């Protein structure tokens, strides 16, 4: 929890069939870091590559002087599996995640640290005039609303890979093994201070299948909300069905018989109020489903920063 | 399990924004606890405030004589969390929680105090003559009547911070970890002997979508009824379109026919009784999800108070 | 997991307000188990009792050249838990249940620990002539028959509290955490050989309502059946209705119009097609519900009795 | 993790009646073991058998010079349990699962050792001119597509139960505690390189009912698209109830009334509406459902094979 000036830099980035990109990518990063001023290391973790990546990450390790630590995996476990990999392993007190495509300039890295050493837990990245479509711009400003109610603060870029977190935020997200998650959202859940700045990046052109399965796990991960929706929506069905009921029977008898079809239609307005009650129960079932998911994951439910005790005097 | 005299108590207030009242509350409170005769400890917990509350909290942790003890925590988690955290430092025989607005006088103290000495396990608090709404009197006599049922203890007031516990009461609730519950009801789940007491408080003057949210909390924690009643209501539904599907069938071939949508009449009564199955399917669901969740809690099961064995002669 | 013959006898007897029976119970169970030349212990565990059944046990364990053994649970548990409680206390090779309102006569105890020492590790009671109503003589039969082919072990008297269990039995029950179970199917589950015999009681006269809540819980403990059967069912209503559309598209077609409603019934067909889905949609929640909870409870897989490994010449 | 040449080979055979084939079992297996120039053992697991079959198994572990290690259960627990065990007690390089039944040969045991010599991880069988029926042949087909999407191996024959694991595969299984899965498709979630070779077997001739049971089991421990499909159909369903209802209300106003039942009708189109809607909700409760059941079986995320840390100098 400490806020004190960074003395030492981790970087980790997940390696995944990147032959072409590594021997650019070891060079400007090593010069980025050396430019600091700090002691520093780089995290070289290969998801079960097919394409030489793995030699040429030995070959760097072995190199005279050389900083970077290479984690080999038995075999492809994904993106977020490799990162966690990664976190424990760092030695450093300030933790950064890049790409190995290039897309985000490793020259970028300076003025994370240099914002970090102001104060803030987490420093993200917002990506400037990347002119993305309007269904995909429209998206992240839903999620973006929904990351600032639930968690306090914003995230302009969930997609954005160049983030700095510090060593007690790093710690803590060890200690939550849940499976179906985003760890730039679970870094603000722990997180007191944080902010975000803009950067530029490599020109633009997942898939659409891709996106939706996406927006489940980011609801999931973030709310429970939608469940309680189903009851709210049930009452209002059965109280219009049941109003209706009572309107055709009073009216009838006050105006006598009016139509043929008189008889059906107070048979449907009883069935729209089961149709409600139906909701409601499913409701009813989500209430128990979805605190059951809560207990689960199991996350921690406080940090304590320091106790003060009294003089013994 | 002690029925012993007190010797020691402890104090638990949580504080999130409280600069103005923080100079009066440790004035009075001090001051209440001096009349015991006793020893005593407060314990101050920020659940991450942002007016300058910190700051004072340590200042008088380390002021000449104090009884003082100040926990910090990283952000806000909540008055539960940060309640617990306070448990997780305890070291008195009963521990009394407070608020910090001075809605509840401090000097209400030490009838706690002396009603605890009889041998009460845990002690309440009833505000008298606060004068609430009908919707929100009705709403805490339904309450108090479910948490009788349940607990076999009566609760007259579920929103009072106000509270008196015993440590072996404290020390049973640090082993359920349940993310969702209510600390006054889980007191009564392992308590032996409790009781009420009247007060005052300050005049009066959360909010409605808070109210309806904690009506869920209150009922999930209680009991899983509700999960029943969906195969009871069903059942109903059922029979009664099973019957006058038969009535019908009878009718007419005794009598002749008699209505021109005699054949739509008998199709509803037919989909009657399936609508109703289907609460029996939701209800058959319940009864299995029900009984996660209480396995995923695990809440002890029994608390053993001495065990004598027969003399070795 | 031996089959030894038997040398020491633990006695379990749960009281809840049993003030008028002690004296009797104490006197009759302790000749029983003198007439036995084994060693033998009587653990009397008080749930909360508040009819000065505590204080009696204190005396009778007190008392000179006593086998009694006293365990004071903080208040009451129920009676599942009570015996919980004595199983983690017991000391024996053989362990006897047995109910504190003389209802079973101790008398019987010599009976159980002959045929113990012929090889069974669980041994059972049957009640003779006990003429019970028909609702509960025709429950009990279904019962015995569900527990047959689940278990593959009988039970005549789920409800008789006489049984004896090898110490073997009771270790691993005490390895099972769940919170809804009865213990009698629990021991079928890790027996090898069991047997049943009859026995005499005291003559008769859980209330209906008790008496349906306890189905419930036998059926959940038992089986996951019954979420397998509504996809069954589904799929009868869907094929039923799909074949009803076509033969009125057909009919028509090559028979011309013929009822004035034909309109209103195909439309009908329709829905109940739908309406069966539902039904299978459900059903495929109950296959990931029932497995969460086997998982949840966490029974062991098996138990090693013993290996051989090859001579070392 | 290694991939170096095999030098012990353990050999996993599940026992349950079989007094007949033990001799020739022994015999045959046996010979194939001492063919291979390597140290080998072979485990005997009895599943509560009652046939004479432990007996014979303790008789060959206690022979002169003898490889082979017996382990009895306490009772029948299961084909897959009995697995387990024997995993728990392997001390060789390369684990072999072969039938009590003869119907796989145990001369092809030495081809699976030169296969895995290569490097491959986990040596799959497939059998030859099975002739089965084409309904198990085409499920056959339909449950390799899906495993081979999965997983990204294929498995010809899932049902076949010559094998061979390398042992890093058999301690992580280890790892995994679910009670409901198929060993088979665990060891490819995470084997490095995979291969099928085929061979022959004994002239054939589980039941219809076993058969479908074992369908539930197979998806459920695959794929939790299921749940995903409820709230595609939904969607289906009801922007088509939405799409006739407007086109009826459209149509009579600018072309006037056209049939006796037309507001019939448009009472039908509302209905579908909600009951599309209903999928959804259930599909809703899948996604919470579904990530529950993966936090419950709580399978390891990666295995890290070597790290390489910078030389020292």
């Known amino acids: 929890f400490d806020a004190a000036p960074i003395k030492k830099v981790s970087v980790v980035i997940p390696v995944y069939n990147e032959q072409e990109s590594l021997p650019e990518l070891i060079r400007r990063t090593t010069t980025a870091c050396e430019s600091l001023g700090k002691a520093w290391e ?6 079960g590559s097919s394409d030489s990546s793995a030699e040429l990450m030995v070959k760097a390790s072995q190199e005279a002087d050389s900083h970077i630590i290479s984690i080999l995996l038995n075999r492809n476990y994904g993106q977020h599996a490799a990162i966690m990999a990664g976190f424990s392993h760092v030695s450093g007190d300030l933790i950064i995640t890049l790409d190995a495509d ?9 003025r994370l640290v240099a914002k970090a050493d102001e104060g803030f837990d987490v420093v993200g990245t917002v990506r400037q005039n990347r002119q993305d ?4 711009k429209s998206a992240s400003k839903i999620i973006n609303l929904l990351i600032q109610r639930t968690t306090g603060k914003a995230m302009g870029d969930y997609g954005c890979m160049l983030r700095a977190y510090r060593r ?3 710690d803590t997200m060890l200690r939550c093994h849940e499976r179906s998650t985003f760890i730039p959202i679970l870094a603000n859940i722990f997180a007191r201070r944080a902010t975000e700045i803009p950067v530029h990046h490599a020109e633009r052109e997942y898939s659409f299948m891709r996106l939706i399965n996406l927006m489940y796990d980011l609801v999931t991960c973030l709310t429970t909300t939608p469940l309680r929706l189903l009851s709210l929506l049930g009452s209002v069905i059965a109280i219009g069905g049941f109003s209706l009921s009572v309107l055709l029977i009073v009216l009838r008898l006050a105006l006598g018989p ?3 079809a008189e008889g059906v239609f107070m048979l449907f307005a009883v069935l729209f109020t089961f149709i409600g009650a139906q909701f409601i129960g499913m409701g009813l079932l989500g209430e128990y489903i979805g605190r059951i998911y809560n207990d689960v994951r199991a996350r921690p439910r406080y940090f304590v920063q320091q106790v003060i005790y009294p003089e013994s005097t």
Do not use: G, M, Y
């Not at 780089?42 to 998801?47: E, N, V, Y």
């Not at 290039?102 to 300076?110: D, K």
């Not at 479509?133 to 995909?136: A, V």
């Open 42 to 47: 780089i995290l070289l973790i290969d998801d």
């Open 102 to 110: 290039l897309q985000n300039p490793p020259e970028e890295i300076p």
């Open 133 to 136: 479509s309007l269904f995909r």
């Open 168 to 170: 007690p935020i790093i």
């Open 258 to 260: 009016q139509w043929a």
